[PDB]
Design a protein around this ligand. Structure first.
Ligand code: 42A
Ligand code: 42A
Ligand code: CL
Ligand code: CL
Lengths: 341, 341
């Protein structure tokens, strides 16, 4: 087979990070399908080969596991699927239609990679232990492997959603109202909270538009990514609030502040769920320490970092916890953050 | 001279970190002066030699500067001063009295090491530049050099303050009321704020004693260290609040929360001084980036880390900033954190 050959070749190239503007240009109209095809048939084999080369450089005890071999098999097949289109003609509509169908198949093939890689982490802990050095190496690899995955699934979604044969550009909303996404994520977390706990904290939202007070806060962003982060934070904050007030009657509300500055758009979620000692904060972001026979926070932080943001937690044991999503306010500063190969 | 010989010998030993309990035992009574002398005449040459060996391993362009040579000369003389007492007899009261006088001299000799090392940083920036690699190496060294200094000045203060010929044990207050220290630091910052700005924010304090509600929060700590941290944070928060509301009439108060948990004692200072973009947070803790022709925060964080605590900043650009001091609530968990040699 030529799979090792392809990996070596395309690993020589560096991934090309795209900005929000570039995403909006690719999706401005259906006339750009050919340009998207020409870009992706080269870029997707590059990004796939770079992360596949890093997988092959893992230690033999990790590389020989069934989880890694299964994931690697799905990365080899996806690579080969894209390679078939390198010599095809963009002017042929059939070539473009087949490319879209191939991307949907590739996306579905990798839909279970996060629980599979979690199974591998649990196997490692039981087979070799949970030492700190192992934690760092696993954290280093999975952060890069999951950020690569996010970037590859972003490109695929933009092509398939737009070139399917407007206000929203695929998964990007150029006028995303942050408060509405906050409400949506709270409402979903509330439904689950009421069902499992028979009680739910209320929600309070306050907006601070520094430059234009009393004007609703909008941004260019991927609302599905923002929902995923806010949903995970709401679930954790509601659980802590309800469980810490089981023997009390008052249930403190969850308070969200949306602040718009000259370059940051910040979203703070404040709860009074008893808080967490500082010693345990790092474990909440660790894949290995959160694994038990709990990746919402570490993956949520990767979504924030994907467009040059961040997600941070600061708690006060005995009182409550604050969780801040830092996003770039300006589309010019919103650029893909890809793993440094 | 035997100075290089002494450094090599005592650098072989590891510093011995002490706990709060051990500090209270050394200072329980004046009868323990002999034990303190026997411990310090060995421990102080160990800690001095370890940081002196690291200084000698700096690159020649840093080591040859007048600032480092001056500091190193003060570390060689202080070492030699302590070496004189190694063969002396602890039972002789004159030996003990002379040791105390020697420690006061050593302490005063090093009183200007923080502005001197700041002069060296400014010289480096102008002579070789402010590249990121230089920033990391300088940050790594100064954090260790300033934490060593804090630990050596703690030992000296405990001996000189107690064995000078109770409620407080030297610089340690076994019943430190945190809120009172907060008020003291605010009052000092307010005086300076009113003098320079003709306006000052008010103060609001709220205590959360999770285990014993409505009971004042006390701890075993060094109130002078806590004051230094709170004073620096108050000065920065007041400056930002006043300057960000110059064209407004309302001046938001600075809100402090003191929370006591099972293992953390947390102090949050919240202001509405307009906040800071996330990109600038790391620069606030950098010695090199805060140097201009501003070490309060980086040194304040070292005071917090000295007894296994921390100091963290999280801001919301366009609104305000939160600054949290994390301390250990229990004296059993309060142990010296020394540089890993
Ligand atoms: N995210 C988040 C959290 C928000 N509050 C929490 N309390 C305990 C543990 C995690 C959390
Ligand atoms: N410490 C601290 C600060 C608290 N608020 C601030 N605003 C701007 C810059 C630094 C700070
Ligand atoms: Cl994947
Ligand atoms: Cl010093």
């Amino acid at each position: 087979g030529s799979a090792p050959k392809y990996i070596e070749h395309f690993s020589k190239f560096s991934p090309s990070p795209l900005s929000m503007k570039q995403f909006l240009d690719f999706g401005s109209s259906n006339a750009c399908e050919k340009t998207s095809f020409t870009f992706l048939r080269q870029e997707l084999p590059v990004r796939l080969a770079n992360i596949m080369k890093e997988i092959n450089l893992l230690p033999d005890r990790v590389l020989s596991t069934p989880s890694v071999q299964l994931v690697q098999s799905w990365y080899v097949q996806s690579l080969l699927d894209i390679m078939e289109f390198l010599d095809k003609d963009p002017e042929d509509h059939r070539t473009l239609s087949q490319f879209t169908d191939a991307l949907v198949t590739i996306r579905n093939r990798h839909n279970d990679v996060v629980p599979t890689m979690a199974q591998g982490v649990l196997e490692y802990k039981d087979t070799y232990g949970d030492d700190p050095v192992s934690n760092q190496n696993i954290q280093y690899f999975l952060d890069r492997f999951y950020l690569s995955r996010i970037s590859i699934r972003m490109l695929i979604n933009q092509h398939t959603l737009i070139f399917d044969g407007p206000k929203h550009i695929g998964s990007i909303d150029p006028n995303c109202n942050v408060s509405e996404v906050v409400k949506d994520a709270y409402d979903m977390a509330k439904l689950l909270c009421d069902k499992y706990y028979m009680a739910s904290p209320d929600l309070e939202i306050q907006e601070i538009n520094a430059a234009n007070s009393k004007q609703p806060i909008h941004m260019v962003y991927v609302p599905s990514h923002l929902y995923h982060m806010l949903f995970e934070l709401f679930k954790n904050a509601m659980r802590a609030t309800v469980e810490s007030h089981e023997s009390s009657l008052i249930l403190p509300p969850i308070k969200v502040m949306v602040a718009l500055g000259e370059e940051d758009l910040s979203i703070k979620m404040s709860d009074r769920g008893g808080g967490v000692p500082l010693r345990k904060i790092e474990r909440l972001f660790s894949y290995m320490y959160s694994t038990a026979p709990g990746y919402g926070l570490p993956i949520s932080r990767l979504y924030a970092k994907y467009f040059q943001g961040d997600l941070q937690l600061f708690s006060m044991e005995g009182f409550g916890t604050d969780a801040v999503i830092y996003l770039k306010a300006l589309s010019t500063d919103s650029v893909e953050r890809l793993p440094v190969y």
